[PDB]
Amino acid sequence: AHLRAADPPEAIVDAAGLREIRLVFSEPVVDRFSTFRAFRLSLPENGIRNLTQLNTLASELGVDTEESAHHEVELESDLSSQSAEVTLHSDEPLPAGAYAVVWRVLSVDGHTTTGFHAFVHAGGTASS
């Protein structure tokens, strides 16, 4: 499988009120065996200067990351579109910050893949 589509995209977005992340894969995702988590990333003193730097940080996290050593976003996932689309619904609106979603997916073809998708939320839980 591979990721076809993700919203928010890999971008600095405003999106005040954001409370969901959507991923669309190229194949149906098998339930149970596929898992999804997201993190609010700690930015280094004086920040990051492009999304390449953000991607480097995000690439080190995974589904077996330890929650107490990081800042996990609590969320609930559901499968749709004959299980090719995954919607991650956050408990409350996401504040501003840099975020990564990480996964391990077993696809209908029987292969397991891992990956991540990262973005910068420049809006807050509500409109300025």
Q: Does 117 bind a second copy (CB under 8 A)?
A: no
Position 75, amino acid: L
Residues near 22 by beta carbon (within 8 Å), at least 6 away in sequence? 5, 6, 7, 85, 86, 87, 88
CB of 67 to Cu ion, least distance (A): 29
Q: Residue 105 CA to chain centroid, in angstroms? A: 13
Contact 102, 75 (CB under 8 A): no
For residue 84, give the nearest of 36, 25, 32 by alpha carbon: 25
Q: How many residues does the chain have?
A: 128
Q: Does 31 bind Cu ion (CB under 5 A)?
A: no
Q: Does 109 bind Cu ion (CB under 5 A)?
A: yes
Q: Does 42 bind a second copy (CB under 8 A)?
A: yes
Q: Does 15 bind a second copy (CB under 8 A)?
A: yes
Binding-site members are: 109, 111
Give the interface segment with a second copy, choosing from 2-10, 21-29, 80-88, 106-114 (CB under 8 A): 2-10
Q: Which residues bind a second copy (CB under 8 A)?
A: 8-15, 40, 42-43, 46-51, 54, 71, 95-98, 119-124, 128
